[PDB]
Design a protein around this ligand. Structure first.
Ligand SMILES: [Cl-]
Ligand SMILES: [Cl-]
Ligand code: NA
Ligand code: NA
Ligand code: NA
Ligand code: NA
Ligand code: NA
Ligand code: NA
Ligand SMILES: [Zn+2]
Ligand SMILES: [Zn+2]
Lengths: 21, 28, 30, 21, 21, 28, 28, 21, 28, 21, 29, 21
């Protein structure tokens, strides 16, 4: 999930956009 | 897990900006 | 509208705190 | 919904809770 | 105090409410 | 400790939301 | 709502300005 | 109060410091 | 109302996210 | 400047990146 | 954990407040 | 830089002000 992915290492804008509805 | 709680606050702010009119779901 | 954009930022922070493990959906659409 | 309701007047935490999943 | 209680574990809004005036 | 410093910033935002018209003392 | 949004930023600013002194927030 | 004092016009750091304990 | 100041706070947060390692400049 | 460009109408990610170093 | 990134977000908020009309550059690298 | 100076020990307003334009 986003917490596991993006709280452990920094997510780029593109990686964050993966989690948009 | 306070670390994740704090991170999540910043993540939802980031998703709000990035997702725009698409919106997003979030759960901690 | 930037006023709504700024309000929404605060709304999602509020939902994050209020909803807890339930989570929430948000869209600024509207 | 939430924008029309909660950006034009202040929503209580109870009102905000209605938008939770 | 609030830091000892709420920075070492997550405090709910109900726990935080105890610190209101 | 900066970790506590950052935590506290989020604590006071949460207190602001929860306490409403009551307000609050923040006495770390 | 304007005053509500402002207050959120006010408490964040007080948190930083006041440091270990802490602060008193009341919208009264 | 602080809202009347600091939400119409920006408060300086000195003005904000009034509310420190 | 302090709308410009509030807007700026959110702009700096957005720039921080968007600009990443490039950094940014903020002038009101 | 960024305030004139982005404080009335919402700036996109692309528009915001104009103000990066 | 994304601690440095989170710290920086709060740092730029602090600079925004303290620098006032002077503004600031933020340069992580 | 500012991250090295301010991300383990808390920086004062005076210390932060050195990073202003
Ligand atoms: Cl705002
Ligand atoms: Cl944080
Ligand atoms: Na307005
Ligand atoms: Na702020
Ligand atoms: Na005082
Ligand atoms: Na902000
Ligand atoms: Na306006
Ligand atoms: Na230290
Ligand atoms: Zn705001
Ligand atoms: Zn934070």
């Amino acid at each position: 999930g986003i917490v596991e992915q993006c709280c452990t290492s920094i997510c780029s804008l593109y990686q964050l956009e993966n989690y948009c509805n | 897990f306070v670390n994740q709680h704090l991170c999540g606050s910043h993540l939802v702010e980031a998703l709000y900006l990035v997702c725009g009119e698409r919106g997003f779901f979030y759960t901690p």
